[PDB]
Design a protein around this ligand. Structure first.
Ligand SMILES: Nc1nc2c(ncn2[C@@H]2O[C@@H]3COP(=O)(O)O[C@H]3[C@H]2O)c(=O)[nH]1
Ligand SMILES: Nc1nc2c(ncn2[C@@H]2O[C@@H]3COP(=O)(O)O[C@H]3[C@H]2O)c(=O)[nH]1
Ligand SMILES: Nc1nc2c(ncn2[C@@H]2O[C@@H]3COP(=O)(O)O[C@H]3[C@H]2O)c(=O)[nH]1
Ligand SMILES: Nc1nc2c(ncn2[C@@H]2O[C@@H]3COP(=O)(O)O[C@H]3[C@H]2O)c(=O)[nH]1
Ligand SMILES: *[C@@H]1O[C@H](CO)[C@@H](O)[C@H](O)[C@H]1NC(C)=O
Ligand SMILES: *[C@@H]1O[C@H](CO)[C@@H](O)[C@H](O)[C@H]1NC(C)=O
Ligand SMILES: *[C@@H]1O[C@H](CO)[C@@H](O)[C@H](O)[C@H]1NC(C)=O
Lengths: 444, 438, 443, 445
């Protein structure tokens, strides 16, 4: 059996193996530095370390049987997979993170930290997988900040133990005292000093000896570099979060300043601002071409027939004229958004647009009298006789009605040439639509 | 030692700029240090002096035997000849700074004793430091790690300058006079670097200044420290935004199209097909669109990039032996790159056809209606007869689907016709090729 | 009555209901932690809380009888609105926040109407005249709420630990200097600002829970400072983004003109044009600024910007409405520098110009003389665009046309003019008869 | 009878000569108001400088009553209409309010002279637009604004300290009777030190004691965290703008490298393209000229096209007898391409549809064999002017007659056959003139 790297069994395995790598990092530097946590809960840490080593054995056994892409298809030959895992440095790392060195010195198990690529791959898969990527980036950086804070707390306690407890004013105090002697106080005051040094706050006791001066200089330099990276990345991510709305409001006040300068009257100004308010309120700010230019025509056609074919399939002779030509039409259609009371067409105008109504309600009104001839809900179509314009007709070359908007309608336009070069490969569809347009145009 | 230098090929001259960088960085670090600390003791002047002598010999070797050999362009053609190249170096502005920096005030040692302030003119090789920065940043395959190393180098150098200035102010106020100045009890450079870190990183915790010189010093130091820390945040943020730019844009378009599909309530199968398309596009190209990348480059480099990737695949086609180089070149400038997911159709048995499919890192299979007739590895081509024939032509004779992640190259019918109407003789011989095919 | 969700009444209601939500957040955490406000102003807080609950029940009634868009139309069936409100989660949140739990810690369910305040802030951000000033006001309001909540949290932790047993906690509140409510609140706010703005001038912790609370507080303060820096950087880089783009454009133009070795009088001409542009605010260009609005809205905008100057010329009024719409959308505006010649003699007549905010004049061959000085509303470029065999001229000009001041024109090239005279050459022929009359008269 | 032109340089000289006394008025008026030892000790200097600042203010009123303004495109010059345009604004109201002529110990009554901030803002905006160091001036302007804020806060802290009483608390200024804390230099430098350590979130001040001090310090720390946020934002935007073009070019280089490592190009083509792009960057022409000149008007584009290309297109002897209309049309419709060494411009036997005008380059014609330099061309030369006229009767038939390779980094001008046909389809006499001159030169060859 071969597991797929893009599957979900592999991701559940990534979670069940990115638990003990994180355990190894966090609690192994803590067990190696504090040394009462190790020699107190010895059976607990031995059970957890044996479980971590068995999970690493299964990690090597899974990476020696995972699949990879070669010439498009999933390669599943076991000998080729063994060789392809053997040739990479990750196999050397997974072998170096397995040698069973370990009692009272758990520093000998630091070779289990060499499998950091697994935790990084788990973080990367969850970032590209979950539906909250910015909050997961916040969580990833907060976990990195906490790991670095915990590691410098452990390093401050180790430097204090190596120099001598309670000797200077900078080191951890004398450990024989029962107030500074418990492990909770040990770890919590080491975390307090670690965060008040790595934050560059400095409400901590100043150093005395030269090795303490050197460690505190190096620690504030690491603190300012880490905190500069954190501030910069959080500012960049907040800017990425708000960029869309910022450029939208940029476009808004740009067109506002334009019309205010070019002296457009207040009713048209207020209608444009109301249209932009409606656009933001119903979330149609993105453009279809600008969002799906990159996707290929096959997937664009899948989304097109998922969105508009259910609305197009209810008109008369369009019951599967030809599948490829219906695909071409639902790809080459183009959206538009209208305002209430806006005339789609006047009298005495050339027609070059077929409009389909979809989530909208237009109306056919007379010229002088505001009247309701017939209302048209979604799925209806209009424009056909003026797009066709076949020889032998009345041949006005004009739109013979007033299709007026009732509310905030939303049509999906289709130009005459985007009809023509769509149907150019199959002229029998043109012949059928020509006869239907001819009969409605000649019976009037 | 060649006759001339290769500005972009010389590993030797890159190590030479590394040596001039080490000399110039030696001077920029250690001239403040010798100037303000008591480190030039009586048993040390000979060591510091042989260091400055080998520094100035590296300077003079750079001015004489290397810099009149670097190649340059004048009027488009590269320059090889040595006297004209040396004249180009002599009438350049680098020689101005170099002869201004090699001015030997070391002869003033016999007039005013030993003072490394006289060698402050050797700090003018910043142009040869920046040429080294630009060469290493251009040659390294990861520019962001060298940008971080250069930012940390600037930070450590500014802090060393501030430690030296603080110790000079401590001597000028008198060591151990007030409570702000350095008290003398430890390592001078270490405690002064500690003072410069906790002031210019704007951290706090140091003794309060008392004398007005100390208050003015601490004020200007904290203000320049706020500006240095702001420059550090801005520099690291720019390194992040320039290292993850295409990843953030790709993730932004991927999240905006999944937001579009969740806004239109798109089914889970179509959303999974779209997201596995995006995941394979990221694992293949590390980029979203390549046609938009190609439309920015100039026309002849677009043509060269198209030919070097597609001309063998065209010239191995037995049908395209008769056609000619100009419209083959244009039609290779006008191909489309697509990616078809495994299990999808590219041509149905009975579907009309208007495209030519070149396959490239893919594996498609032809079905004659589920049994596979033939398979095609990378480089093969199919779908020709329904490309060149006018009118309805012929429909596709069989179902062909992508087994794996096929990356086809498509040439549409009407685009081929638009290329053909600019080339009438080859269009005529292609019609005759159609007639001898049928 | 059905409440319009986009009107002015709805926004005024969002103001009147995002006042007591902010009151409930701010003063409920303060009255829960401080225990002196709740003891002193008991009837005042009871009156204000009863008023906030009346505003909450009026809020759930107004969100009941408000409208929502269906098929582009605002529905008005009140039972349909009630069903649409009953099925969603905001009615669940409102009926959860209206549990009648009539010391002041039992009223913390009134904080659940936070989306109403959020909607008011977003509606004001959309609706106001000063979006960046409102963004910085909203950011200061958010960090003041956070500072106040952390001050009340520190005071509650100090009360739970004990007053003055340690040196980190608040002092012994029986001493009359540290026992007043004013100094209690101002010292808790000052401690909270010193902790959250990452400063740490405060006394250091002594107990283990104090050490842990100060670590959590400093990490919260790091993230708050990073969010403040990010939001002010986004605002300060989006407030002068137009200036930065225009500076990059000017620098690219300067780079090109320095590279191609063009002469200094043309250099000063281009830089005086760019200084005129930046001092008169014409920075954005037409084709890019009018691409993101719908087609009928830009047709209406073209109507409203050029009919007021196309109805000032009398002889051009005899034209059909559809032709007027198509030409008023196809008009292209350009801005001409002073002294620049629009159409010289012998040059092919390409374009038809309409004078709007400009003072052009005609001159002779390389001689500044004034045959007739044109003004606003006039028109020229008419006899070389209809492709007529004229008075031995053809497709050429008649005389030189200068530019006295910073004129602005309405260009109409022959291509879009054939796209004009593909619709009713009869009306264009009437215009051609009067143009030929002028032509035969003057040449 | 003079009219000050607000786009000239005399107006900028006046903006400088009025942006010195406004800035002085702000800075040293808040200082003289809050300190009350400068105002008592340097009284002759402050009276002289105040009288000079009010003289410059009244001359600024007189000048702003005589600056023209662009209506109908022209600069209006009648003094009555300029006075009316001045009087209808609110800036004249602010100026006449600032020029109110108010025991020579309180400059608190002279705070109306601060109301000419518009001159200082106009000077800063005109300098930012005009000077050639825009990022250096943006950082100088930010430093000046936060220095004004730090100075105003130092004067405010000293005024609050004088109101509370010197040496009463531990947060306020020390006792001024003790003659070490009593020098005026010491007073101002310690007040500036306190305001910088507060307003840039340093926090080394003594902790406050009373409620009013706690409230002033928390308000001052919130103003300080906002000032630190704007400082970090401005310096980050300055760093992101100082090398935005270079970052865009490195992004383009990395995109080309990624595309080439994707499509598996040959190493020689990869290093050719990389050195090509680095040469295009070092020669400062990497951006395409239509994208440069998109924002220019058509007349300025035409004048730039004349000034660039007519110097080379009047060096041609074959295309000389035509008209300035076609000259301007061709210099508008020339499009440039930059080449690489060893690149084939036009091989033998190709459909000639482009014409090339060499400009800052050096080329070569060769045979089908390879590197046999027949004729090396130079700047101002031309080729392609015989297969784009499409003359029937000769042995070629629009076919390339030579293998043309570049030997250095050339820079040509592609003039396409369709572009020339669009240029000449409204000139039949120029069409037949080019046809006959091509026929004569082709019967010569
Ligand atoms: N005139 C007219 N058009 C109709 C009617 N029902 C549907 N339509 C469509 O409405 C149209 C709107 O203008 P068109 O010229 O585009 O063509 C018309 C028809 O295609 C009807 O009863 N009358
Ligand atoms: N029918 C068929 N087509 C094949 C086979 N091998 C390659 N091809 C190509 O596959 C094609 C797919 O549809 P086409 O009409 O384009 O024409 C067919 C052939 O050019 C094969 O075995 N059968
Ligand atoms: N010659 C001339 N043209 C005028 C006059 N008044 C308006 N115009 C227009 O100015 C023009 C400029 O060039 P045109 O060829 O466009 O044609 C000319 C006329 O239409 C006038 O008094 N003389
Ligand atoms: N073949 C050729 N072209 C030359 C020679 N000298 C100048 N030229 C020009 O060089 C040209 C380059 O290609 P063209 O087809 O454009 O036409 C050719 C001529 O106009 C020469 O000796 N031979
Ligand atoms: C620590 O405390 C013990 C007893 O409390 C004492 O004997 C020892 O000397 C102390 N050591 C230090 C270094 O303070
Ligand atoms: C506070 O002070 C009062 C008297 O001053 C005393 O009775 C009380 O015990 C003190 N409380 C604490 C916690 O110290
Ligand atoms: C300041 O010093 C004078 C001089 O002795 C003294 O009288 C006065 O009380 C002092 N003020 C304070 C607040 O200590």
């Amino acid at each position: 059996i071969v597991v797929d790297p893009s599957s979900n069994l592999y991701y559940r395995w990534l979670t069940a193996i990115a638990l003990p790598v994180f355990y190894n990092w966090y609690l192994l530097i803590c067990r190696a530095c504090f040394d009462e946590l190790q020699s107190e809960y010895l059976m607990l840490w031995l059970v957890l370390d044996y479980s971590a080593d068995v999970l690493y054995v299964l990690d090597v056994l899974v990476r020696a049987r995972t699949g990879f892409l070669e010439q498009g298809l999933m390669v599943s030959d076991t000998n080729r997979l063994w060789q392809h895992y053997k040739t990479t440095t990750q196999f050397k790392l997974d072998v170096l993170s397995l040698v069973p060195t370990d009692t009272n010195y758990p520093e000998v198990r630091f070779n289990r930290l060499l499998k950091f690529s697994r935790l990084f791959e788990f973080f990367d898969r969850t970032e590209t997988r979950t539906n909250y990527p910015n909050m997961f980036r916040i969580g990833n950086l907060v976990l990195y900040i906490l790991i670095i804070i915990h590691w410098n707390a452990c390093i401050y306690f180790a430097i204090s133990k190596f120099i001598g407890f309670g000797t200077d004013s900078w080191v951890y105090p004398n450990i024989s005292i029962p107030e500074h002697g418990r492990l909770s106080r040990k770890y919590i005051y080491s975390l307090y000093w670690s965060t008040l040094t790595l934050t560059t706050i400095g409400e901590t006791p100043p150093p005395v000896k030269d090795e303490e001066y050197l460690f505190v200089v190096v620690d504030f330099l690491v603190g300012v570099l880490i905190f500069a990276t954190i501030v910069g990345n959080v500012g960049s991510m907040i800017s990425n979060m708000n960029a869309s709305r910022a450029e939208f409001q940029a476009k808004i006040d740009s067109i506002k300043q334009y019309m205010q300068f070019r002296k457009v009257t207040k009713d048209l100004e207020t209608r444009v601002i109301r249209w932009f308010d409606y656009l933001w309120a119903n979330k149609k700010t993105v453009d279809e071409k600008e969002v799906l230019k990159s996707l290929p025509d096959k997937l664009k056609a899948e989304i097109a027939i998922n969105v508009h074919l259910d609305t197009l399939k209810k008109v008369r002779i369009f019951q599967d004229c030809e599948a490829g030509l219906l695909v071409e039409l639902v790809l080459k259609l183009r959206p538009t958004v209208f305002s209430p009371g806006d005339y789609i067409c006047k009298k005495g105008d050339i027609g070059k647009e077929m409009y389909i109504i979809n989530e909208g309600k237009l109306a056919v009104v007379a010229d002088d009298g505001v009247t309701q001839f017939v209302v048209l809900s979604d799925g209806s179509y209009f424009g056909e006789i003026s797009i066709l314009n076949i020889k032998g007709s009345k041949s006005g070359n004009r739109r013979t009605a007033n299709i007026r908007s009732i509310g905030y309608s939303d049509l999906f336009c289709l130009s005459k040439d985007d009809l023509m070069e769509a149907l150019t490969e199959y002229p029998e569809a043109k012949k059928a639509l020509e006869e239907k347009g001819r009969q409605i145009l000649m019976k009037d | 030692l060649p006759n001339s230098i290769d500005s972009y090929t010389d590993r030797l001259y890159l190590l030479w700029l590394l040596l001039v960088t080490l000399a110039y960085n030696w001077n920029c670090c250690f001239i403040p240090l010798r100037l303000v600390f008591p480190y030039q003791t009586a048993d040390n002047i000979h060591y510091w002096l042989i260091a400055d002598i080998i520094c100035d010999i590296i300077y003079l070797y750079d001015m004489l035997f290397i810099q009149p050999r670097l190649q340059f362009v004048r009027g488009g053609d590269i320059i090889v000849d040595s006297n004209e190249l040396r004249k180009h170096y002599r009438t350049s502005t680098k020689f101005q700074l170099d002869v201004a920096s090699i001015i030997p005030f070391d002869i003033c040692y016999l007039f005013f004793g030993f003072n490394p302030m006289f060698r402050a003119n050797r700090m003018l090789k910043y142009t040869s430091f920046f040429e080294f920065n630009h060469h290493l940043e251009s040659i390294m395959d990861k520019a962001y790690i060298y940008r971080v190393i250069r930012t940390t180098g600037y930070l450590l150098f500014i802090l060393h300058i501030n430690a030296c200035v603080y110790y000079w102010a401590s001597n000028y106020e008198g060591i151990g006079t007030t409570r702000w100045v350095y008290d003398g009890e430890g390592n001078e450079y270490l405690r002064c670097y500690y003072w410069a870190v906790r002031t210019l990183i704007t951290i706090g915790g140091l003794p309060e200044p008392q004398t007005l010189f100390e208050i003015v010093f601490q004020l200007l130091n904290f203000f320049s420290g706020v500006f240095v820390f702001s420059s550090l945040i801005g520099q690291m943020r720019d390194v992040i935004g320039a290292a993850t730019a295409n990843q953030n844009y790709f993730r932004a378009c991927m999240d905006d199209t999944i937001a579009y599909m969740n806004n239109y309530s798109i089914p889970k199968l179509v959303q999974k097909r779209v997201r596995t398309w995006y995941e394979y596009t990221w694992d293949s190209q590390r980029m979203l669109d390549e046609s938009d990348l190609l439309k920015t480059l100039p026309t002849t480099v677009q043509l060269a990039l198209a030919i070097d990737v597609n001309f063998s695949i065209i010239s191995k086609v037995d049908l395209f032996k008769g056609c000619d180089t100009q419209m083959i070149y244009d039609m290779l400038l006008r191909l489309k790159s697509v990616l078809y997911l495994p299990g999808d159709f590219v041509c149905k048995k009975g579907e009309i056809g208007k495209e030519m499919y070149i396959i490239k890192h893919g594996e498609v299979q032809v079905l004659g209606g589920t049994k596979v007739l033939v398979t095609l590895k990378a480089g093969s081509v199919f779908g020709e007869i329904s490309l060149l024939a006018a009118g309805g032509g012929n429909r596709r004779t069989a179902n062909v689907v992508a087994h794996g992640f096929a990356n086809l190259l498509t040439l549409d019918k009407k685009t081929l016709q638009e290329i053909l109407v600019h080339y009438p003789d080859s269009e005529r011989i292609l019609m005759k090729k159609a007639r001898v095919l049928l």
